[PDB]
Design an enzyme around this catalytic site. Structure first.
Site, PDB file in Angstrom:
ATOM      1  N   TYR A   1       0.690  -1.233  -0.133  1.00 18.99           N
ATOM      2  CA  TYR A   1      -0.147  -0.108   0.101  1.00 18.99           C
ATOM      3  C   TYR A   1       0.887   1.332   0.052  1.00 18.99           C
ATOM      4  CZ  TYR A   1      -4.319  -2.505   0.203  1.00 18.99           C
ATOM      5  OH  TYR A   1      -5.500  -3.128  -0.191  1.00 18.99           O
TER       6      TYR A   1
ATOM      7  N   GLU B   1      -8.968  -6.707   4.181  1.00 17.22           N
ATOM      8  CA  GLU B   1      -8.185  -7.874   3.554  1.00 17.22           C
ATOM      9  C   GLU B   1      -7.558  -8.610   4.818  1.00 17.22           C
ATOM     10  OE1 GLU B   1      -5.882  -5.479   0.828  1.00 17.22           O
ATOM     11  OE2 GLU B   1      -7.827  -5.005  -0.221  1.00 17.22           O
TER      12      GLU B   1
HETATM   13  C1  HEM Z   1      -4.741   1.843  -1.682  1.00 16.94           C
HETATM   14  C2  HEM Z   1      -6.216   1.601  -2.233  1.00 16.94           C
HETATM   15  C3  HEM Z   1      -6.615   0.779  -3.640  1.00 16.94           C
HETATM   16  C4  HEM Z   1      -7.812   0.838  -4.120  1.00 16.94           C
HETATM   17  C5  HEM Z   1      -9.009   1.977  -4.208  1.00 16.94           C
HETATM   18  C6  HEM Z   1      -7.642  -0.221  -5.459  1.00 16.94           C
HETATM   19  C7  HEM Z   1      -8.751  -0.260  -6.325  1.00 16.94           C
HETATM   20  C8  HEM Z   1      -8.798  -1.515  -6.971  1.00 16.94           C
HETATM   21  C9  HEM Z   1      -9.689  -1.455  -7.994  1.00 16.94           C
HETATM   22  C10 HEM Z   1     -11.155  -0.542  -8.337  1.00 16.94           C
HETATM   23  C11 HEM Z   1      -9.707  -2.395  -8.755  1.00 16.94           C
HETATM   24  C12 HEM Z   1     -10.570  -3.356  -9.862  1.00 16.94           C
HETATM   25  C13 HEM Z   1     -11.441  -4.273  -9.163  1.00 16.94           C
HETATM   26  C14 HEM Z   1     -12.453  -4.708 -10.306  1.00 16.94           C
HETATM   27  O1  HEM Z   1     -13.309  -4.089 -10.942  1.00 16.94           O
HETATM   28  O2  HEM Z   1     -12.364  -6.056 -10.435  1.00 16.94           O
HETATM   29  C15 HEM Z   1      -8.297  -3.254  -8.128  1.00 16.94           C
HETATM   30  C16 HEM Z   1      -7.436  -4.219  -8.664  1.00 16.94           C
HETATM   31  C17 HEM Z   1      -6.647  -4.685  -8.385  1.00 16.94           C
HETATM   32  N1  HEM Z   1      -5.682  -4.114  -7.620  1.00 16.94           N
HETATM   33 FE1  HEM Z   1      -5.991  -2.711  -6.228  1.00 16.94          FE
HETATM   34  N2  HEM Z   1      -6.508  -0.819  -5.145  1.00 16.94           N
HETATM   35  C18 HEM Z   1      -6.002  -0.314  -4.249  1.00 16.94           C
HETATM   36  C19 HEM Z   1      -4.417  -0.773  -3.589  1.00 16.94           C
HETATM   37  C20 HEM Z   1      -3.963  -1.802  -4.301  1.00 16.94           C
HETATM   38  C21 HEM Z   1      -2.399  -2.101  -3.780  1.00 16.94           C
HETATM   39  C22 HEM Z   1      -1.626  -1.464  -2.715  1.00 16.94           C
HETATM   40  C23 HEM Z   1      -2.100  -2.989  -4.624  1.00 16.94           C
HETATM   41  C24 HEM Z   1      -0.877  -3.750  -4.608  1.00 16.94           C
HETATM   42  C25 HEM Z   1      -0.326  -4.511  -5.679  1.00 16.94           C
HETATM   43  C26 HEM Z   1      -3.146  -3.518  -5.586  1.00 16.94           C
HETATM   44  C27 HEM Z   1      -3.057  -4.462  -6.604  1.00 16.94           C
HETATM   45  C28 HEM Z   1      -4.418  -4.532  -7.377  1.00 16.94           C
HETATM   46  C29 HEM Z   1      -4.287  -5.795  -8.438  1.00 16.94           C
HETATM   47  C30 HEM Z   1      -3.222  -6.884  -8.782  1.00 16.94           C
HETATM   48  C31 HEM Z   1      -5.656  -5.699  -8.957  1.00 16.94           C
HETATM   49  C32 HEM Z   1      -6.084  -6.927 -10.268  1.00 16.94           C
HETATM   50  C33 HEM Z   1      -6.933  -7.887  -9.414  1.00 16.94           C
HETATM   51  C34 HEM Z   1      -7.426  -8.898 -10.632  1.00 16.94           C
HETATM   52  O3  HEM Z   1      -6.900  -8.753 -11.685  1.00 16.94           O
HETATM   53  O4  HEM Z   1      -8.420  -9.571 -10.574  1.00 16.94           O
HETATM   54  N3  HEM Z   1      -4.294  -2.565  -5.498  1.00 16.94           N
HETATM   55  N4  HEM Z   1      -8.032  -2.437  -7.274  1.00 16.94           N
END
Ligand code: HEM
Ligand code: HEM
Lengths: 144, 144
Positions: free
Chosen positions: A93, A135
């Site tokens: 994060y 989480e």
């Molecule tokens: C801190 C606030 C964060 C927010 C608001 C956020 C928001 C989101 C959103 C909206 C999605 C798309 C979800 C969907 O429509 O399926 C997503 C996916 C993803 N995020 Fe986050 N994220 C955050 C932090 C992080 C962090 C720290 C990581 C670390 C690598 C991360 C890695 C990912 C990954 C790998 C996906 C893809 C999951 C998939 O392909 O199924 N995110 N995130």
């Protein structure tokens, strides 16, 4: 918890950031992947490197709701499921936060005061702490 | 959101309230049912009038966690299901808040300064708002 001036800054500036959404999003991902190669495997589905384009904009939407975060919980829970599926760690994060702030600094430009950037850092931290805790409990739930 | 002074009062005094838990709980329910007969049917199973004895103590536990409310979400969700099942309304929360504060005032006696009572009023409001929103989404979810 955030103090009032921090909240005023977030509420006052998030529409600016949203208006320039495409720049925030693209700068964020460019810098995330370039500067932190270790997280690239988490965004590898299956075919060029893939992006949840709403990631940064969803931080902004949370920030807009900084005073009623419970209202966004249905979205958070769904995103949290995807995070735990992908292997997102608490230690990720600050990395995402760092590159989001870089993008915010770019968009605001001459208007990017230290107090405003500090405010977004604090807001991001509060938003991230929500995801982190949700989480953690999801990870715990998986081995019940 | 709560200011830092409010939070500091909550953290400093919640252990006193917890030490006097039995008085808070019993005073709360006595006054709730006596002064608000309209909510009595919600505590009616079926055979004496029933009490979730942990209700007030759970507010105090939430207050103990006022800076990491996401940590208590697994409990909140479970309680919320019971609330929506029973027909708890947003308009009920100020009533419960009023009688909780009455019980707190009773326990603190001499130490019930206006600022301490004000802080507990604000803290309760933030905690109640979490339940209200979660339950609102549950109610909506039920008619999807
Ligand atoms: C801190 C606030 C964060 C927010 C608001 C956020 C928001 C989101 C959103 C909206 C999605 C798309 C979800 C969907 O429509 O399926 C997503 C996916 C993803 N995020 Fe986050 N994220 C955050 C932090 C992080 C962090 C720290 C990581 C670390 C690598 C991360 C890695 C990912 C990954 C790998 C996906 C893809 C999951 C998939 O392909 O199924 N995110 N995130
Ligand atoms: C932040 C405020 C509140 C907290 C922390 C709280 C907490 C609790 C807890 C811990 C229980 C027992 C759950 C269980 O173990 O099954 C409960 C049950 C119950 N509460 Fe709340 N409560 C709150 C507000 C309210 C309000 C405003 C009402 C309005 C009348 C209410 C009415 C009830 C009723 C009727 C039950 C019984 C549910 C059942 O019998 O299945 N509560 N509450």
């Amino acid at each position: 918890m955030l103090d009032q001036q921090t909240i005023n800054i977030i509420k006052a500036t998030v529409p600016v950031l949203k208006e320039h959404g495409v720049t925030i999003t693209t700068t964020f991902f460019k810098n995330l992947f370039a500067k932190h190669p270790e997280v690239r495997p988490l965004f590898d589905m299956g075919e060029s490197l893939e992006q949840p384009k709403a990631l940064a904009m969803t931080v902004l939407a949370a920030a807009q709701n900084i005073e009623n975060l419970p209202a966004i919980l249905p979205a958070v829970k769904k995103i949290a499921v995807k995070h735990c599926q992908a292997g997102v760690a608490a230690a990720h994060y600050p990395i995402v936060g760092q590159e989001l702030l870089g993008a915010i600094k770019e968009v605001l430009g001459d208007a990017a005061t230290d107090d405003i950037l500090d405010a977004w850092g604090k807001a991001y931290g509060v938003i991230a702490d929500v995801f982190i805790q949700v989480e953690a409990d999801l990870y715990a739930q998986a081995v019940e």
